[PDB]
Design a protein around this ligand. Sequence first.
Ligand SMILES: Nc1ncnc2c1ncn2[C@@H]1O[C@H](COP(=O)(O)OP(=O)(O)OP(=O)(O)O)[C@@H](O)[C@H]1O
Ligand SMILES: [Mg+2]
Length: 264
Amino acid sequence: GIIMENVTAFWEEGFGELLEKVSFSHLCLVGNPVLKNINLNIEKGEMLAITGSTGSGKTSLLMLILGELEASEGIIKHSGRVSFCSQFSWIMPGTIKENIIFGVSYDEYRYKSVVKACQLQQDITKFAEQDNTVLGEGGVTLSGGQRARISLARAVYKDADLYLLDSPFGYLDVFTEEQVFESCVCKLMANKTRILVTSKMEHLRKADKILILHQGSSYFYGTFSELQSLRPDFSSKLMGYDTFDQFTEERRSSILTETLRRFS
Ligand SMILES: Nc1ncnc2c1ncn2[C@@H]1O[C@H](COP(=O)(O)OP(=O)(O)OP(=O)(O)O)[C@@H](O)[C@H]1O
Ligand SMILES: [Mg+2]
């Protein structure tokens, strides 16, 4: 499981460099918080959806769990192997397969089931060599979604206790992404403790807990139901869109941000 009791963390010199790699020294000198009074309790097998305004601390909270940012006040409790899957989808030179099982024991069943749920079948079938196509470093002629699904597969194949998925559903092939959410994150991963950063409303619905950050602070925590009751101005605005989850990542963040400001 993963517990966070009143946690706060400050700009440490060097942290913002890592945040580029995944002005800073002014935030460091001045001593601001990057997250502030963060609280959450996720029990084994639960799925936490994290969302919020753009630049609100979401990736920084993942760096906290990974142990890259140092929590000044608070307790952070969790244990085991943790599998991280960043926004930036990196690709090592080698085959699509090699990339997915990087430095980890092959397991024909486990592999086929990840490859499958992550919607990579539609993809590797396009290629003369299937999942034995060799990729150049950075996976460059691929699409943004293709890289993202390769990077997700790689991360989900890893066997671990906690899975941190940072924003893999933000590209244009929006239906595949709906498939992937459902087969991978919701079915195949259903028994694994997993945190998902996201700007799609659907993911909030189907989650166990929810965390919405804004200007570094927790603007909400607790379940999807509580969200509608407790922050209703929020809930009205967002839920009352036609197909908000098929807006671009860019437009979804814009509204989340404009909305979080209105009702602070
Ligand atoms: N590449 C960057 N250049 C300058 N400042 C940055 C950069 N990445 C993050 N920050 C700063 O660190 C804090 C934000 O980051 P985090 O990286 O925690 O945001 P998120 O909540 O993950 O948002 P985003 O949609 O940008 O990923 C912000 O207040 C922002 O000012
Ligand atoms: Mg982020």
